[PDB]
């Protein structure tokens, strides 16, 4: 385990890698909003399908 950990290690500050979580969140939020608005359009269409009958 330690062998692979040292093999795949990069010379750089650790506090910068964890920071990437912010970027990843900012890039996931977009897709999450797109899923919100798609499940919303879906819901709306559904309620219309239950309005017409």
């Amino acid at each position: 385990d330690v062998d692979t950990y040292l093999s795949n290690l990069q010379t750089k500050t650790t506090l910068s890698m964890i920071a990437d979580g912010l970027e990843r969140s900012a890039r996931d939020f977009d897709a999450f909003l797109e899923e919100n608005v798609t499940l919303e359009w879906e819901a709306q269409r559904k309620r219309i399908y239950q309005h017409f009958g």
Binding site: Q10, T11, K12, S16, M17, I18, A19, D20, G21, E23
Partner: protein, 45 residues
């Protein structure tokens, strides 16, 4: 034969003289590489 080994020693010297340059080259490469590793990790984070 004392005058003969001089070429041999100076030869080893001449040979090593470039091995040092190789060391410099590889070092410079390593710098140039790790500088990239930083970026890769800097994007990965």
């Amino acid at each position: 034969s004392n005058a003969d080994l001089i070429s041999y020693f100076s030869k080893t010297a001449d040979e090593m003289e470039e091995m040092m340059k190789k060391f410099e080259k590889t070092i410079t490469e390593i710098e140039a590489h790790l500088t990239g590793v930083e970026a890769h990790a800097m994007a990965m984070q």
